[PDB]
Design a protein around this nucleic acid. Structure first.
Ligand SMILES: [Mg+2]
Ligand SMILES: [Mg+2]
Ligand SMILES: [Mg+2]
Ligand SMILES: [Mg+2]
Ligand SMILES: [Mg+2]
Ligand SMILES: [Mg+2]
Ligand SMILES: [Mg+2]
Ligand SMILES: [Mg+2]
Ligand SMILES: [Mg+2]
Ligand SMILES: [Mg+2]
Lengths: 322, 332, 322, 321
DNA sequence: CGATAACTCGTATAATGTATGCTATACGAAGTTATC
DNA sequence: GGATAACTTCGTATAGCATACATTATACGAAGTTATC
DNA sequence: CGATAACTCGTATAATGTATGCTATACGAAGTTATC
DNA sequence: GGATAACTTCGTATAGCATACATTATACGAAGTTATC
């Protein structure tokens, strides 16, 4: 149509209104779909119910995850609705097939995974293992971890911290102002406070790295093979890198990741959030305080991130034995 | 399956849509299918008896039927199910849904208000708390009957792990393992959710472990790691392991009913619900014990795989630790 | 329009889908709106936006309260929307004049009032003062005042408690189950617990009134001049009666009220609700607990019912006067 | 066509909005019409495509997301009240606004608040004016005492009159605040001054002689000589009261920076912020803090005390034990 | 110099809040089957 | 050939749990890119 | 049979959340108007 | 006469307060009612 093409360019025009990752994915999915449509001879747009149905069944067949499969379907939906046409999910065949695949895969045993926990226990060990190392890069990494566990911020969030977003409490603790997270985009943002210990781990890095010479410099920067920080206010350390710190720190204590092709074999971006949640639950922290901690507003996820004490567990075991 | 999509009535994209729905019938739980079919039956029967066309449903008839269910004394939650299944049957066949019609919406609201105003209130399982497990145990631990040994292990596990019966019935021998402490660890695979908060694994206490260990020793379920932990035990006191057939949740529910009968006698005369323990009695009782013990809410919800604080608060509302700010203020 | 009359017939057929009070006021406003329309040759339905404007000004002129005028417009709005027709408030004429009337009256000095508090201070007096009486009347009224202050339940709610709705905590405190309230109509309801002391006051009344003969009997009932209680399971004590209990208790300690003709010169139904709100406030109870106490979800009315200390006062004064 | 009729009715019931509202409406409208007649765009009815360009312009001019929101807002009010469809309902506009906000928050744009005028400050300021016979000082030292002690907002301060003052059993002053622009003024009808502040306010009431007439606004103008000019037909302007804050701040820290930054020196809300902050360190419950200053939005008070240590959170506690 | 430490891409998949629609349990009773 | 313990199936009544929706992140091996060694 | 304690009804006005639309402050600067 | 102190009046850039919406409940003085005294 014409109004359709219009609504599309209007979406593309102000494509900044959406996330970079959202577009990265709309595209990725669109190629995948286009490819399949072609190799199967189907009009990829508008997408017809039965075609999106065979297509999802196809992805299921390729052994992809339910979340993965919902993503393509999801993106196809965004493309159509946003353009003014009905959603392929607005059709019985697509909406029902999607339900079916979830149920079928779940039953066959599939289940969503989640970052391996990086809990308090681990932090201490890692700290009493790098606490000294004058190595300018060990200084950095030990601060990252400290901040990641203390604030539960997501990596992409830590990466965007500038030196100017730091302040303090009359008590001497640091306040890192976070402006944009995955769930909030406001000019009011939020303030995450660090403890006396971690605020310390961060101060040492701020000097050693000399990132503080310009308030607009991102807090964390890359350190080259000679051991020299490269402060900057244009380029922030990549999330791929922040994930690396977790992998490296994990390898530094457990060594080579058991080549099994599986994810979460070592710590990663989210390892600190799940870990931190788990540490609060055990500590008896309340539901509202655990939400403030990770910027959540629903008990769920915190619940997913839990399957606490394994061995001699607790709670009912502690209650029964006494 | 369904009553009978009228050759005339049923027509066009509805026979089409209806077909698509059976094509992907795996998109809904079998229990969901059980209730859909029950409601249609129920509605089709009312329709014949009252000379009404059962499909598509006219709003004015669905309203009459809804007031009909109310007069039968059914609960608002039940009435809601019937409307719900009728809405699904319709939406999924491409037609408007009742309750989307002004009359049906207004009558549902009226029925709900009138009913609440008549004193109708939701119920919950009679709790089977720690103090019940102890009494029940002090009595059954001395029995050699294979049945009593099995039933006492079930109770221990039910109370210790807070698992749903459907889940206990699925446990197979190989899903058990030992811990450093010498206590059992039960692993629960295959749920229904991708985010199974329940807990992949549940640890049994030392006491409960001994109880399960004794059932395994006397039933010989260990003869095959694929046997389900719980099986039948017949008239002659002989267990019957199997790896293809698990105990029916009905039977487990029977163990709670029977264990309550053993101690308190036959059930009351009214046809009241929850006059004896059922398959949720342990979960409710455990939540209450943990609360009384001071366990945190997140820690309680984690213990039983809950996700809706509203339900756990429902289970511990009558505890004194939940009386409020005014009571505190008055009693200082 | 066939549709309009069919929508109206639907509503009147299931009028019981709304509060009896909602119906009571709909009818009041309509007749009032019918009278004016006739005395001015105006079509009363569907109402014309320019006429509703006039009518709302006529009410302002009549010197009625901002809320009273909002109620009138409010019903005329409902009548129409529920008809399938647009609402008078959908017109700039009515929309703006309603903001204006409020704005004006507010400046002119009109303020929304609220019940005279019945705080712990008074309950303690009223109790020590009636606590010894053996008169059924006195015994009943003390129990009512006790529940009213302890639970913050609205009179309508209290008037509905049947003896079967009472249970006890393992500790011994009474628990009253409430099914319906101004803002909740469910089969789940909520439980309102009483203090060891108040449960006493209610126990004494139960035994002396004989309402426990039938679990279906309403907890409170009439008490004739002969001092004898007349329990019932069909008729409940009037909310007017409950109001009278507040008025009566307030005369017993302050004699007749002013000749002002003003509302709230004595305690009324809501008196305990605002009173207890205030006491909790002064005790430092948290926002979530103060809300759990009075069935609120936002903070507005709590903040409304507040004005606390005025003499030495506290807050900033205590703070300043080091 | 009928928009004229619509516009008429809006002007007919113009009392339906505050003076400050019409001000921004007219102001924003001028900015709009200007931009248009300089880009050749019918300024009204505004086409979504045009408004979009305009909004992008306000962004390029460097304004805040909040300010941009005000323009779009007033623009909407105009149309809605004229019977026309508001520009926010158009995809183009709603899309740019999402873009602008994300782009700006991402650029580091932060919302600011007044500079805290806490207790310590109220003491310093006093011990440096406490002993002074400067007719002006006496006034300004009292305005601060009240502002801090009552958490009242300047417009309110400016409206107090001797008629509205009374005495407590303890002999403290009790300012009665009436006609507050709100039907549900969940803030209070009476505020009590402390013994200390009562003294200060008294000292000003005599030296100013505003007590000569009851309708006399507690606070008045004071000429370049040291003579209070009481009145009951005109009140000290809010701008002036603001200044009193600025002035007292300059008196202690000098002048501001070149950076046209906002909130470099105390201002109207500086009292509330600090007032809120002190009560918090004391341990005053949120509701008790909220009512003390007439607050009804817990997020606001939470903003004022966010940087306090007592609000650092569960993880900090957990890491320190 | 070339070799290295230390850091853009694309497909795959987790996350984020929650009314309410789907999904369990409740439980009397009919149906089964191996044992008395 | 019964009667019966102990299930299993069934169908309807009700309690309770979890996901569709629309984006927005992370996961991670494999390439590509620089300043150092 | 009265007199009386203790209890329908109709108009008037309060109470229920809260996203966001209206309101108020911020502040440089330009007019004012009595003192210096 | 000229130069200010100390303000007003202003326009616009921003922060923050509270209300529309759709019912649902209470206020309270009167008139009506019914056992009792
Ligand atoms: Mg079923
Ligand atoms: Mg018990
Ligand atoms: Mg049994
Ligand atoms: Mg038994
Ligand atoms: Mg029992
Ligand atoms: Mg309204
Ligand atoms: Mg309608
Ligand atoms: Mg969402
Ligand atoms: Mg039998
Ligand atoms: Mg509401």
């Amino acid at each position: 149509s014409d109004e359709v093409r219009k609504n599309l360019m209007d979406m593309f025009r102000d494509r900044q209104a959406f996330s970079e990752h959202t577009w990265k994915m709309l595209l990725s999915v669109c190629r995948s779909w286009a490819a399949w449509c072609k190799l199967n001879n189907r009009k990829w747009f508008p997408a017809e119910p039965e075609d999106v149905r065979d297509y999802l069944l196809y992805l299921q067949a390729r052994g992809l995850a339910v979340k993965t499969i919902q993503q393509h379907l999801g993106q196809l939906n965004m493309l159509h609705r946003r353009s003014g046409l009905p959603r392929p999910s607005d059709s019985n065949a697509v909406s029902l097939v999607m339900r079916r695949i979830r149920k079928e895969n779940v039953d066959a045993g599939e289940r969503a995974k989640q970052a391996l926990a990086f809990e308090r226990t681990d932090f201490d060990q890692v700290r009493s293992l790098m606490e000294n190392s004058d190595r300018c890069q060990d200084i950095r990494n030990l601060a990252f971890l400290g901040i990641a566990y203390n604030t539960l911020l997501r990596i992409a969030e830590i990466a965007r911290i500038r030196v100017k977003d730091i302040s303090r409490t009359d008590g001497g603790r640091m306040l890192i102002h976070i402006g944009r997270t995955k769930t909030l985009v406001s000019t009011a943002g939020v303030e995450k406070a660090l403890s006396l210990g971690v605020t310390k781990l961060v101060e040492r890095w701020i000097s050693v790295s000399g990132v503080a010479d310009d308030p607009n410099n991102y807090l964390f920067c890359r350190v080259r093979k000679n051991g020299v920080a490269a402060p900057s206010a244009t380029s922030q350390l990549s999330t791929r890198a922040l994930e690396g710190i977790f992998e490296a720190t994990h390898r530094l204590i457990y060594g080579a990741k058991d080549d099994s092709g599986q994810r979460y074999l070592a710590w990663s971006g989210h390892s600190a959030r799940v870990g931190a949640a788990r540490d609060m639950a055990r500590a008896g922290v309340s539901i509202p305080e655990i939400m403030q901690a990770g910027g959540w507003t629903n008990v769920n996820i915190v619940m997913n991130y839990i399957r606490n004490l394994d061995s001699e567990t607790g709670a009912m075991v502690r209650l029964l034995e006494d």
